[PDB]
Structure 1
């Protein structure tokens, strides 16, 4: 007869904040200044350069701490950065990961606080990454660069690793007045878009020196994914008319040639970029970001249909498998990366009309994370989703500190610290617009 008791969303937001503060205390105790905590053993690891940590998880956490009103914790992290974080290091850093995690994490912390030193450090790092773009006659970045010397390595790259810079670099250009950052990021994206096939698709794999594709596989998934996000995000952040056009053209080519149904559910397998023949049967969990991008570009019904494929994986397996075979619906791997893309899609679709269904689905995902990944000193990736209980690995990935706890808190809290109508998030969930003073 009566309804089951309605969710108290403010109480659930307070629980997310409590858990985030508890995890931060574990990082301070076991991994202070180090890149990642291993929260089962209570130890740390490096991410970018073995033996030369750069405070990765501390930097990733900063904007999340501020949004939650964890102000003492935020200021302790900012003060560590200002005293300790140098990028004058004789070692190789992966250009893509360094931009989205460290340049973006310093920019969101700068926008929250106003502190000039955080902008100075973001810009210093971007100038070291610029050497990877300058080493290509096409302006396509090499995958790795030595932060001190500018030496490059590995030009056999991909759309995500040449095309996930324009949000962070374009905000640098706005704040500093120097257009060079925006221009270098946009030039790399134009290169691959100019090489689209007659059916409107790009292959995912590209060589920085020849400028030619090195496979025939078009993908929406890993090695391509965030290129398509950053086309739309550059329209939203900068008003760039080329990027607005390109975002819509690329998505409608993918809907025409990659959207396929298997057992009644929508998937986007890999296809030959010229002929449209299917070339893969795998889909990763990370492809769930695309449900939210579909809604952003004006394809909400199709975005909700794709989200439903992942909702069915969550209801069936509890945790979404890291990879599935689309022809059967069954897992290709048993381990996970404590991945954030399902609540990413839920937040992006919820920002359109505030439909409470997206809150219900994200609450299932948060509660499942608490039931499976909680460890002695924080939250961990999984070894095997098929055992009962699910067995645990021993690592908290840096992106956990920027992404899913922020997504849950934004969905549940209605915080006055954010202007929800102006909110813009990077592919690492760094807030690049929408802070309100308080």
Structure 2
């Protein structure tokens, strides 16, 4: 057997990323997303008022890969062109994790003050969504120019995925208000945990009350649980360290369920642990890595194995599965990053080469299924051979899985792997070595 040449595989990831970037420059320059089958662009936040989403998402990946000319071309576009004084509604959660976080990682890589100025300007526009709630729970949408808010029927992910970006803003700016605003919203829902330690995933920004009874690790909730741990790691916050482990141990006690010998975390009633759903999202795979981070690595490996089963059986992990049968519930995909997310997070603990093996399967399968004329695309149908394609490269592809693969394979000297911290959008918030 020829041992894998990990440096060669990293160089292939870089080559493919640079090739994809060239397609973006050719077909979608300054636009939010490329449609790489048609060779066109689409808007993400505001129809017809693109904000360079994929360009911004790509920046820290480009830098980490040593694609310096490409990085600088993107940074220079941002500095000349990007602004947020726009009379249109933006989804607060998406805007923070993609644009605030993408500008912050680019700022930390480069030192360029303008990138921080723009991140902070955008955060100040998002802050109006928090200020519009007497509980500090952000409304889901805000008008970037006027501050007008819409839709208070929100969820843990959309109230609780700010503290990393906002806390880094507080560190860099010296203004504590960003950290405090993000932490306050998380504390609100944690103070409403049931006696079994769970939160329902759906919450109202104005009443402050839960609007469902369903505890979740995936839809409506995922990154809330990450950002508790990540705030301990990034800021030393004692409360978040406590909360992170309490929340995960409640989930292990009441949501961990085995079906056909495999670990899943279906939805349960947040006050009884009784099962209220049978679906698991592909996107739940982040949790395997979080389990390892919080000191539950055997459980994290067991959960990873459930997704390794889906990859081995279906090639591409189905977008959703029925835990009771282990079979797909959907045939389309979102070109999703969570399996290599988990592999990188678990690999950062002891550098076990098994995680590299598994992530290499995932990268090669992405190449075999999602490659299109001008980049990489989400899929229409994973059950046909070949798998049929839809026509969209999601913005998160630019920040997430190509970075994950590259960090797993490259051992790049541009990252201090002991200090590396990643947001839920894979924006690097600590660990650059200039």
TM-score greater than 0.5 by the shorter chain: yes
Looking at structure 2, the residues matched to 321 and 86 of structure 1 have their Cα atoms a distance apart, in angstroms, of: 37
CA distance in 1, matches of 2:225, 2:136: 19
C-alpha distance after superposition, 1:339-367 (max 9, x if no partner)? 00000000000000000000000000000
CA distance in 1: counterparts of 2:107 and 2:273, whole angstroms: 44
Which residue number corresponds to residue 235 of structure 1?
A: 232
- For residues 4-40 of structure 1, what are the alpha-carbon distances to aligned partners after superposition, in whole Å with 9 as ceiling and x for unaligned? 1100000000000000000000000000000000000
Choose from 56, 72, 75 the match for 1:78. Answer: 75
1:74 Cα deviation from its structure 2 partner:
0.3
What is aligned with 1:218? 215
> 1:209 deviation in Å?
0.3
Post-superposition shift, 1:275? 1.2
Instruction: Give the corresponding residue for 1:247.
Output: 244
CA-CA distance at 1:58 after TM superposition: 0.2
1:297-353 deviations in whole A, cap 9, x for unaligned? 000000000000000000000000000000001110100000000000000000000
Alignment partners' CA distance in 2, 1:101 and 1:81:
14
Where 2:134 maps in the other structure, the secondary structure is coil
Superposition deviation, residue 276 in structure 1: 1.3
CA distance in 2, matches of 1:345, 1:101: 19
Structure 1 residue 126 and structure 2 residue 123: aligned?
yes
- Structure 1 residue 185 and structure 2 residue 182: aligned? yes
Structure-1 separation of matches of 2:88 and 2:218: 30
Displacement, 1:408?
0.2
Structure 2 unmatched runs, 5+: none
CA distance in 2 between partners of 1:331 and 1:11 (Å): 34
Counterparts of 1:59 and 1:221, CA distance in 2: 25
Secondary structure of the residue aligned to 1:418 is coil
Query: What is the distance in 1 between the residues matched to 2:351 and 2:29?
Result: 38
Q: CA deviation at 1:222?
A: 1.3
Aligned partner of residue 123 in structure 1, secondary structure? helix
- Please list the CA deviations of residues 256-289 of structure 1 after superposition, one character each: whole Å capped at 9, or x if unmatched: 0000000000000000000111000000000000
Alpha-carbon distance in structure 2 between the residues aligned to 1:216 and 1:401: 35
Q: Please give the per-residue CA displacement for 1:220-272, whole angstroms capped at 9, x wherever unaligned.
A: 01110100000000000000000000000000000000000000000000000
Please provide the CA RMSD for this pair: 0.3
Using the alignment, how far apart are the partners of 1:256 and 1:276 within structure 2?
Answer: 9
Distance 1:321 1:216 in 2: 26
Q: State the Cα distance separating 1:292 from its structure 2 match.
A: 0.1
- What is the Cα deviation at residue 198 of structure 1? 0.5
Q: Distance in 2 between matches of 1:361 and 1:179?
A: 41
Cα distance in structure 1, aligned partners of 2:273 and 2:375: 45
Alpha-carbon distance in structure 1 between the residues aligned to 2:272 and 2:37: 48
- Aligned with 2:93 (options 96, 100, 104): 96
How far apart in 2 are the matches of 1:21 and 1:269? Answer: 39
Deviation at 1:190, TM superposition (A): 0.3
Q: TM-score, normalised by structure 1?
A: 0.99
CA distance in 1 between counterparts of 2:107 and 2:410 reads 23
Please state whether the residue corresponding to 1:93 is helix, strand or coil.
strand
TM superposition shift of 1:105 = 0.2
Q: Secondary structure at the match of 2:183?
A: helix
* Counterpart Cα distance in 1 of 2:432 and 2:245: 28
- Number of equivalenced pairs: 434
Tell me the SS of whatever aligns to 1:361: helix
| 1:180 to partner: Cα distance | 0.2
Q: Name the SS for the 2:277 alignment partner.
A: coil
Post-superposition Cα deviations, 1:42-65, rounded to whole Å, max 9, x if no partner, equal 000000000100000000000000
Q: Does 1:277 align with 2:312?
A: no
Q: Following superposition, which runs of at least 4 residues in structure 1 exceed 4 angstroms of deviation?
A: none
Deviations 1:143-200, CA, capped at 9 Å, x for gaps: 0000000000000000000000000000000000000000000000000000000000
Match of 1:51 among 41, 48, 63: 48
Deviation at 1:381, TM superposition (A): 0.3
Give the 5 Å matches for 1:263-412.
263-412=260-409
Take 2:272 and 2:30, find their aligned partners in 1: how far apart are those partners? Answer: 50
The one of 253, 258, 281 aligned to 1:261: 258
Using the alignment, how far apart are the partners of 2:381 and 2:234 within structure 1? 40
